[PDB]
Design a protein around this ligand. Structure first.
Ligand SMILES: Nc1ncnc2c1ncn2[C@@H]1O[C@H](CN(CC[C@H](N)C(=O)O)Cc2c[nH]cn2)[C@@H](O)[C@H]1O
Ligand SMILES: Nc1ncnc2c1ncn2[C@@H]1O[C@H](CN(CC[C@H](N)C(=O)O)Cc2c[nH]cn2)[C@@H](O)[C@H]1O
Ligand SMILES: Nc1ncnc2c1ncn2[C@@H]1O[C@H](CN(CC[C@H](N)C(=O)O)Cc2c[nH]cn2)[C@@H](O)[C@H]1O
Ligand SMILES: Nc1ncnc2c1ncn2[C@@H]1O[C@H](CN(CC[C@H](N)C(=O)O)Cc2c[nH]cn2)[C@@H](O)[C@H]1O
Lengths: 343, 343, 342, 343
């Protein structure tokens, strides 16, 4: 299948094991911004669901499929690869919806659906939008979408902005400085100093922050889920040019994302921006090993390149330079090893 | 190999990826009780090392092998299956010890050593001693131990004791009762409440506690690493009879462990008991789904059965009864999904 | 002379020029702990001065010689190598003390005095007690001291103690990390990071601190100015063994000093300890390039080696180890390039 | 040499020791106005560098030679007298520029260079432009300049303007009056008060200030580095006539400087004026011994005579008079002993 060809079996097993726990579905369900906004998108666009055929990609507990059923969907195929599929089946029965929600266990890349659908619904967003590579499954599922069918969410916007945060920088450098020791219990560790700095600075920082740390207006990169192909997400190139609003040290780039549900009645937005109420996605920051100095009015330009790997994640390179001075930073990000800093 | 035959590939890949991070090695190295006690055990028993041949099973950074070299070992074979082997090799060279420490990349079940050794050293302990199943690799390695050779650690003592903790117990229902609502965004979740209760109670609780919650003197189960065979750890039956020192409700069993380094000069102990300073192992509690009343002077008897699984962990079965009343509790736990509660 | 042979001409010139400024003499005079304690030492031991012959080594403005005169000295030779000597003479005349204070311009190693003295007074202390090497001039001056004469100050105690201060450490590490940049205006500086770390960590830090940063009781090293020879200060070896009172990272050693005026009536102490009011000497901290972890109850052992150099300062060597773990640190510092942090 | 004959050895030793510190090179490098403007001057005038032969007088870290290299210079001779030369060599090697930058340790007055150059670059400016007397080394280096050559910077403008600052003036007496007491610990200090006043007034004050203290447009004295001889800087007679824009007491003269890089493409200015962001040069103020009253519309005329001395600095002689009233004042100041007042 397309999934197994792009996914290490080792990664896939642990991945779907993780989502088979009720505690994990609960954590997601209790993100009220997430769950409430999905419900609003669907119910406020009920005419996009009434008497329609729906596919829920990765249904989990089934919660989005219940929302499609509240909106009057005639038939909802709820596909789920983890053992959570069996818990969804239980809720479909106890909610008396056996004639409308059909749970189909397995990967959306591998199952058979009896018919084409009017609309696909999913929550495939990970950290920094792309983590976990579930958007590829979402796009793959379009083989079941009628021409002129819709996608909920319809588009995804990644936002990037430079930040200054000396304390965060020093926190990570302090941990790395362990490997500078020339006599840890009599052992010289210092030859690994470089490897340790590299490793810690490869960790995306997952937490929230005050918007006053942002040094320029964000740049937006848009993915249109109606148009994009699965293969497009194997290589994601995000160019940026920031007009610096403040002078200082740029310690890295901050990332967040919005998705829009573009329905017939209205467009509903789900935002994970630092200006919005907190979600379980928080925000994500890359750090530079060496911060870049820039003054207000300078431009900071470069690219964030995401190259998909077999662990349902990405090898990320961020290159940024202050155009006026040629001060450049090249960085790697290991999205598989995030630092969850939030308390 | 013996390792690949007892381990699901998916579990093995994530396991060794975890130990390939310098930050994870650092976390273990920075446990001063752990690292300092190993150094003391080895240095204070220098005649067990001076001019000896040593095997370090799972050398990680190489730290124990360096301690062996400090104690005067002639040759140390330092085996490591993660990519951390490459970093250990860098430290061996940078510490000018290439003539005495040989880093061998690979699983100790799969590599070849060029000769037999006098002593095996390792830090293979997990939560409640046995988690991760690395003790089997440690025992497996005795195929390379000379007759009358030694093992450091030499023995491992698992301790179990009944505890009372009403707040920890009640916490499981607080969490599970998320599912006991008839209209979560219009969805009746209540049919999954039982499954959620079961899932939470199947999680051993990793954290520390006040020793005043303990209701009887612990029972000790000893594994002698000199005598034990790898297969001995596939099924571990721990009978217990507690003589209750306090009256109250017993909510479960608390677990901790000690290891002893039985050298020619002295025996050194490493303890993770709740009466000792905290280590990265904390302590582990397994709840009974139904608590038992016992009075001081009553006896609480039963068995803890640990059955190894191919996810490098154990299925735990605990059955307990208050002999004087016949009140009984039976519980099943999954050590691969611990709940990390410590704050 | 003994002074010129141990001293680089470049250093001596700038050194005595510095002390030729009235603004600099004023700054020292305005250290009330210093000036007030010297006056108490001398006046409360007035019998060590009454009708005595006194030598003031490096008299500056003359202030200590005036204290000696207040205490009843018969004749005070006030030796001063900088042009401040001429200002001291102006004050001796305007204070009508020409019959008692004789200003002698020049280095104490080179001038001639008409007679031997009963007691020598001086303020020769620098940062970390020994900086500027003026204690050698003070000891040299004992060639003019009658047998059994006294010295004010009489003894000097150097104190050393381990400290923890993560922010200071990272402050210095931060400055050095400038030289880690692979693209400073397009230029790769990183090959100099090592050299930069070495340079910054060679700077003793001059400022004060909270006493709660100290991780063990101080070790004391005593110089008895009555017994010591000038040559004793060329290489000063201070062994130490600290009994750690707290667990944590040791970022370096803190230094301060006391001097005692052991007079016939009473002993008066001038202390620059962090438990005492601040003086112009502050305290001094020598950072380790990498902190040492230790637990309460551990012992931190080693040696502090102070080697006098030809720029009137010291090359500092600190080697320390946590005995229980073998964790060892070696450091070299240049007291001629301090970081004034206060 | 020309350097040793104009410089006291004690001064030269301390001077080059000072610049052998990386911390001192860093301080200059981190002056963004300074470093960024040199870079801009050089890169935006790239036709003045491409395939050219360049001499960097007093190269320090080598930073300006790397800018010359960024602009396409074919060969750069980088002369440095302090031990910083050895660090510049390291950077040249590590930046793979050994074929284009040659580091020549020593004084530009004393070393041998093999060929004539198209352009000399340097940063030889001190406080009040002339302090440290490095501009003479810069001009001396024109013995290596082709007749059709250029100098970067090309011209230097010293600016002088009258100021009113009652608090600065009074401060000298507040400090000197320490000595005006009859019983400082029993000692009459009063006889030294005049000497103390004299000493404070001989020190130029290095700090910045609000431009509103300035009472007239500055008078500009220009040194054209392309045309000037090093001997032109041994005695610098700066006449001035200020047209007073404000009425009040004139307490002295404020000094700052600009330099211009007059290239083929454009002229780039580096300014240390109090109307511009602060640099590590700040500004300099020389007090009059007695303030002068002047009305808006009056003319304040006189001369500032800078007499080079062998301590790599200048004796500053200022005579000033209000023409309409004949009120006159002077001062004699020692630029080698400035008072750093800035907080
Ligand atoms: N190829 C695949 N075929 C089938 N199923 C898949 C596939 N890939 C992933 N999954 C499943 O999607 C689920 C995603 N998570 C729950 C979504 C649910 N609709 C809700 O809103 O609560 C959200 C989520 C988590 N991280 C990102 N989104 C999770 O149960 C996975 O096992
Ligand atoms: N069959 C195997 N063959 C080879 N190597 C293996 C195998 N199995 C596991 N490993 C490796 O052992 C290491 C265990 N951890 C580090 C120990 C190090 N000596 C120290 O004391 O710091 C401790 C530890 C972790 N969990 C419990 N103890 C870890 O680097 C694993 O990748
Ligand atoms: N070999 C020397 N021969 C002659 N004079 C010397 C010599 N060496 C140094 N000096 C002079 O001593 C003075 C030291 N300072 C002033 C002391 C004064 N008694 C007071 O208490 O105010 C304090 C001080 C400075 N550093 C430490 N203490 C200073 O004026 C020097 O020029
Ligand atoms: N006769 C001389 N022969 C050789 N070299 C000399 C001579 N005289 C001084 N120097 C050296 O010039 C350097 C001047 N400073 C650094 C300049 C560097 N190009 C930069 O822009 O960052 C700037 C500066 C400081 N003060 C004014 N400009 C300093 O390293 C001196 O040791």
């Amino acid at each position: 299948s397309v999934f197994s060809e792009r996914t290490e079996e080792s990664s896939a097993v642990q991945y779907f094991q993780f989502y088979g726990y009720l505690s994990q579905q609960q954590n997601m369900m209790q993100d009220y911004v997430r769950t409430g906004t999905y419900q609003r998108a669907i119910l406020q666009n009920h005419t996009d669901f009434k008497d329609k055929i729906v596919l829920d990609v990765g249904c989990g507990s089934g919660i989005l499929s219940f929302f499609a059923a509240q909106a009057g969907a005639r038939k909802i195929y709820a596909v789920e690869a983890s053992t959570m599929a069996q818990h969804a089946e239980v809720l479909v029965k106890s909610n008396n919806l056996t004639d409308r929600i059909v749970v189909i266990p397995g990967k959306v890349e591998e199952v058979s659906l009896p018919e084409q659908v009017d609309i696909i619904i999913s929550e495939p967003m990970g950290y920094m939008l792309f983590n976990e590579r579930m958007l590829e499954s979402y796009l793959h599922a379009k083989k079941y979408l009628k021409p002129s069918g819709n996608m909920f969410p319809t588009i995804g916007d990644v936002h990037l902005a430079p930040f200054t945060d000396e304390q965060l920088y020093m926190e990570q450098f302090t941990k790395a400085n362990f490997w500078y020791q020339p006599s840890f219990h009599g052992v010289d560790l210092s030859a690994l100093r470089g490897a340790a700095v590299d490793e810690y600075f490869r960790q995306p920082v997952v937490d929230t922050f005050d918007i006053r740390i942002l040094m320029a207006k964000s740049v937006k990169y848009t993915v249109n889920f109606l148009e994009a192909k699965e293969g497009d997400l194997h290589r994601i190139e995000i160019p940026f040019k920031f007009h610096m609003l403040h002078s200082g040290l740029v310690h890295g780039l901050a990332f967040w994302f919005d998705v829009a549900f573009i329905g017939s009645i209205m467009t509903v937005w789900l935002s994970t921006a630092p200006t919005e109420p907190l979600t379980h996605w928080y925000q994500v920051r890359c750090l530079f090993q060496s911060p870049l100095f820039a003054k207000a009015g300078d431009t900071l330009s470069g690219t964030c390149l995401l190259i998909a790997n077999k662990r349902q994640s990405y090898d990320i390179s961020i290159v940024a330079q202050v155009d006026q001075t040629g001060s450049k930073s090249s960085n790697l990000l290991d999205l598989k090893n995030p630092f969850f800093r939030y308390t």
